[PDB]
Design a protein around this motif. Structure first.
Motif, mmCIF file in Angstrom:
data_model
loop_
_atom_site.group_PDB
_atom_site.id
_atom_site.type_symbol
_atom_site.label_atom_id
_atom_site.label_comp_id
_atom_site.label_asym_id
_atom_site.label_seq_id
_atom_site.Cartn_x
_atom_site.Cartn_y
_atom_site.Cartn_z
ATOM 1 N N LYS A 1 0.857 -1.161 0.000
ATOM 2 C CA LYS A 1 0.000 0.000 0.000
ATOM 3 C C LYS A 1 0.887 1.203 0.000
ATOM 4 C CE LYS A 1 -2.213 -0.993 3.954
ATOM 5 N NZ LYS A 1 -2.971 -0.785 5.211
ATOM 6 N N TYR A 2 2.159 1.002 -0.388
ATOM 7 C CA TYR A 2 3.158 2.040 -0.373
ATOM 8 C C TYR A 2 3.525 2.270 -1.805
ATOM 9 C CZ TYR A 2 3.301 0.394 4.388
ATOM 10 O OH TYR A 2 2.897 -0.007 5.679
ATOM 11 N N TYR A 3 2.511 2.250 -2.696
ATOM 12 C CA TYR A 3 2.674 2.602 -4.074
ATOM 13 C C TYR A 3 1.736 3.734 -4.222
ATOM 14 C CZ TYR A 3 -1.635 0.014 -5.549
ATOM 15 O OH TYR A 3 -2.965 -0.438 -5.692
ATOM 16 N N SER A 4 2.007 4.594 -5.213
ATOM 17 C CA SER A 4 1.485 5.931 -5.247
ATOM 18 C C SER A 4 0.328 6.003 -6.184
ATOM 19 C CB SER A 4 2.599 6.910 -5.707
ATOM 20 O OG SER A 4 3.891 6.344 -5.472
ATOM 21 N N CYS A 5 -0.076 4.839 -6.701
ATOM 22 C CA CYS A 5 -1.116 4.734 -7.698
ATOM 23 C C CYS A 5 -2.315 4.015 -7.061
ATOM 24 C CB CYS A 5 -0.649 3.973 -8.960
ATOM 25 S SG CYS A 5 0.709 4.870 -9.778
#
Length: 14
Positions: free
Chosen positions: A10-14
């Protein structure tokens, strides 16, 4: 952070 696929959890920016 800067990542754009769910392989960063959940540490992706999309």
């Amino acid at each position: 952070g800067r990542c754009c696929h769910p392989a960063c959890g959940k540490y992706y920016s999309c």
